[PDB]
Amino acid sequence: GVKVVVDSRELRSEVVKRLKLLGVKLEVKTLDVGDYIISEDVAIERKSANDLIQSIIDGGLFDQVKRLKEAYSRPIMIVEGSLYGIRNVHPNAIRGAIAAVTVDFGVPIIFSSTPEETAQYIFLIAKREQEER
């Protein structure tokens, strides 16, 4: 039985449904930053491909990552959905953003195809955290 804190806004998501099916014990809180907290250091920010693209368009992505890093020593970003075929932005803009966050800011960016996969990632990371704590 792994324990994960979930931000109130994610409560009725399909991610939460899968986490519950996986046996995760969820504690609800309204977080200023982050969507799923695994430990005092590990926090996960769930972001749809569309919202990632929008944050690049509006130039707010880096402020977002900064806020995550300042709140957690080991933040993780799970980008959910395909980033391909999503016009309104040159591929280099998306690639450049990804490279900046992962290599410069040092914040891992794990890609998920569905909310279920996002839950599976949260679950496996939380399980490792529990076993290693």
Binding interface with a second copy (CB under 8 A) = 42, 74, 76, 84, 91-92, 95-96, 98-99, 102-103, 106, 108-111, 113, 117, 120-121, 124-125, 128
How far is 109 from 100, CA to CA, in rounded Å? 10
Contact 101, 79 (CB under 8 A): no
Q: H or E element: which one contains 22? A: none
Q: Judge whether 32 is annotated as a binding position.
A: no
Token pair belonging to 69: 């890093």
Q: Judge whether 35 is annotated as a binding position.
A: yes
Say which entry of Ca ion, a second copy, none residue 29 contacts (CB below 5 to 8 A, set by partner kind): none
Using the minimum distance from each CB to a second copy, give the nearer residue, 60 or 91. Answer: 91
Contact 22, 49 (CB under 8 A): no
Nearest-approach distance from CB 108 to a second copy, in angstroms: 4
Token pair belonging to 8: 């109130």
Q: Judge whether 41 is annotated as a binding position.
A: no
Q: Which residues line the annotated binding site?
A: 35, 45-46
Binding residues for Ca(2+): 35, 45-46
